[PDB]
Design a protein around this ligand. Structure first.
Ligand code: S3W
Ligand code: S3W
Ligand code: S3W
Ligand code: S3W
Ligand code: CA
Ligand code: CA
Ligand code: CA
Ligand code: CA
Ligand code: MN
Ligand code: MN
Ligand code: MN
Ligand code: MN
Lengths: 232, 232, 232, 232
């Protein structure tokens, strides 16, 4: 079996293992800050630099994966706490969309909300143009920020949030468990055919965005990942 | 929302949070040993002492949960390494079945392999009477040790195994990720309607068993759990 | 180490984690209402359902704990605002005293004011028979509602009160901080040997009572708790 | 009664409510970073800018207080995780000791470990020169980093730690409860006469330090405080 495994307890500016895109910075405490608080339509993304083989064209086999990460979103004086973080999977050549308006696109899609990715968004602003639910929510996205499915959630300013994600290749099920500050767990699951929506090799990472009036602190604190593809 | 959350880094005799059933002992290192290596058809089970409300007849709501645990199975001289461990959910009055033959029943079912439980088995012996697959496997069980679904797995003697389980109430999906010593992940997922198969109040725990010729060390090293039931 | 931890932001009927005794009800907003406004000598108590091992006869070790809760007492028309709430610790078999007169007993003691418990009382009526100070007070109680120590306090009708309690096992000190509506803090501390006054396994909870002409709304709004006992 | 109350969910370097001393910086996420990772013998301290009257020479009354704060200590590559954070109380003219060697002094004492302060240290290095216990520990300090009392503790890299402190003026008891990431609570309490050891007016704050080969990230995330002094 072919396995990709890594663990980040902290991050650093001169680490070849991470690809930094856009407005992302690494703070002295080791956290990744995805957006720039002084820029209009700010977009920042981080990717694990090595492409992951999620499916084999020779065997037709699809990888399963287990990943856990922690983040924090914090309000900043005078701006609307927006727009949120998305944990995404995309083709290995993925870049911030050209002429990105940031905001509700979460840095992964065009103005119409379309892109080439699979993701789990932690959305803190209700965009009517992308049929967002009225409150903060966790969503399962397939090539669109108009989520396939959402669940109500609450983004608590300054709270450390823990997420665990399981992709079971046989049932094609993406399962997500989000552990909040008040101790409650929020879950969401959806069948997503990764072999049909994504290429053979992909990149995994995080993206966040803001607008002129919607800005907040978006931090990635830690990330562990294991994927296993059967080679028989 | 109603949340039940606990974490065991170690275990102790006299800990009122754990109900011990059958041949269970607590080792000096804090590990739980489920079976007795010198007894024929040995059965040992540990339960979280408090009943957990997994669903409500008033709202029709069903809880989601996130649980992680670690175990170890180790071979002993001359006996067949058998029979394995099951992580199970059962009615609050659950007891080792009367006249239990241990063995392939894993301490949760009768001789015909029927019982009242939902579980995830780490099965190290192929019982033809229970239509077991030919190799070691992880299975999802619904009122029977004749699993609804299985996935091939390998039980490595002396290896610490990590398991993460997500139950998403909306899709009724039970997703399991098993992390082995060699770093590879094994996953299995199945739609199980806990509201249809179990009572409103249940107990969560572990069970293991052996036979005359089939015995091995079955250890529970740690267990964390969080369940959340929306109250409306 | 052996740790018991929980957090209630709200409460619900049928939550197997809480034992309801006497006249307790759960309101639609999630608050616990301890007494029944239409009953003479009303007594209601809520206990965390799982016993807590506060000390071990094997090692001689005693647990430390940290707990925070919020309550509200509100006046009702025609009756005297009485008698108050007590946060208490008692043997695991604890029940409302048989033939309880409620009133100044706070539902934890007999007519003479004696019982088997350790508690922190928020007393709103001056019972001369229990040597109460002349005004509202917070008291530390050891097997009696004739407090070992009191501090003057003011119970404001309809005000949400926040309490934090620390029990340091090494010094045997029970420290209490009460945050009033006017913003001021009230504190009280007393050395109490829980190993000498209580059994190894105990229950934690709240109790309130009224009399014929002494009745008021007694609400428990939230409760968080953590206890840790060092093990061999 | 005379009450001082404040709450910081975040901090800003351009706010007059806080005094910054030495190598302290405010990160974009709003956290306070006390030490500079690239400097030898780095010392940084933060103080609430308004002096708080803890006792009266006219009445002889002493204030009680309740304070809660959260911090994080994180390891950095190639340097020892040292030296720790101290929550301290000191005269209103308090400054980093002249020619401070940082390290085991925690930025509050001289080379011999003596200073004018009362504090609660979260010490991560065993300095034999200050009779430190062999492991990580929480200590209660009275004019010396040779603690009056200590309790074993474990500093987990990247973990958010919650602390609650109660000072009861009647018993002169300083009680501390520390909530760890593994769920366990650690407590320590000591009788400290603030009238005898400190002036009528004091400043409250935090300090941290490093050495040549002993450096780590020291962060202050939040701080709430309430003190009340009886004026009758
Ligand atoms: C209508 O213009 C008129 O006034 C303009 C003055 N103006 C207004 C604004 C602020 N409004 C806006 O930015 C509008 C766009 C908007 O609401 N985005 C959303 O902002 C969110 C946070 O609130 C989230 O981030 C969402 O994701 C994101 O979609 N900035 N400047 C003039 O310049 C213009 O000449 C004139 O004609
Ligand atoms: C066959 O009888 C004849 O010889 C007997 C002598 N014998 C044989 C045995 C051992 N066989 C057995 O125990 C048979 C049952 C068996 O295979 N269980 C499975 O053992 C596994 C480990 O290999 C797993 O644990 C499975 O889950 C479990 O089902 N023990 N004693 C006489 O006593 C009897 O008078 C006589 O007529
Ligand atoms: C004068 O007597 C004759 O007429 C009486 C008629 N009466 C009077 C009352 C009300 N007084 C009482 O209830 C007296 C007891 C009392 O003062 N409790 C305290 O009430 C507090 C609230 O004010 C707090 O709750 C304290 O904790 C609680 O101890 N109810 N009925 C008869 O009852 C009696 O048989 C008969 O001989
Ligand atoms: C033998 O000496 C000769 O070579 C030295 C060269 N040297 C050695 C070192 C490293 N040792 C040291 O730094 C020694 C001091 C020390 O152990 N502090 C503690 O370090 C901790 C982290 O491990 C914590 O921070 C504690 O709080 C802090 O007290 N750095 N430089 C010269 O400098 C010296 O002139 C010369 O004669
Ligand atoms: Ca949105
Ligand atoms: Ca089997
Ligand atoms: Ca009274
Ligand atoms: Ca030290
Ligand atoms: Mn959305
Ligand atoms: Mn099986
Ligand atoms: Mn009283
Ligand atoms: Mn020390």
């Amino acid at each position: 079996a072919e396995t990709v495994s890594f663990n980040f307890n902290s991050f650093s500016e001169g680490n070849p293992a991470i690809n930094f895109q856009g407005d992302v910075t690494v703070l002295s405490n080791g956290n990744i800050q995805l957006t720039n608080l002084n820029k209009v339509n700010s977009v920042g993304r981080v990717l694990y630099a090595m492409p992951v083989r999620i499916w084999s064209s020779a065997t037709g086999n699809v990888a399963s994966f287990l990943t856990s990460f922690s983040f924090e979103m914090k309000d900043i004086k005078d701006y609307d706490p927006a727009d949120g973080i998305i944990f995404f999977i995309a083709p290995e050549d993925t870049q911030i969309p050209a002429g990105s308006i940031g905001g509700g696109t979460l840095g992964v899609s065009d103005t119409k909300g379309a892109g080439h990715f699979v993701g789990v968004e932690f959305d803190t602003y209700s965009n009517s143009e992308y049929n967002d639910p009225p409150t903060d929510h966790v969503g399962i996205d397939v090539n669109s920020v108009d989520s396939v499915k959402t669940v109500p959630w609450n983004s608590v300013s300054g709270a450390v949030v823990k997420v665990t994600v399981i992709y079971d290749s046989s049932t094609k099920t993406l399962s997500v468990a989000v552990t909040n500050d008040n101790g409650d767990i929020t879950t969401i699951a959806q069948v997503v055919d990764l072999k049909a929506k994504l290429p053979e090799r992909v990149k995994f990472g995080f993206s966040a965005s803001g607008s002129l009036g919607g800005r907040q602190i978006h931090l990635i604190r830690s990330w562990s990942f294991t994927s296993t593809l059967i080679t028989t």
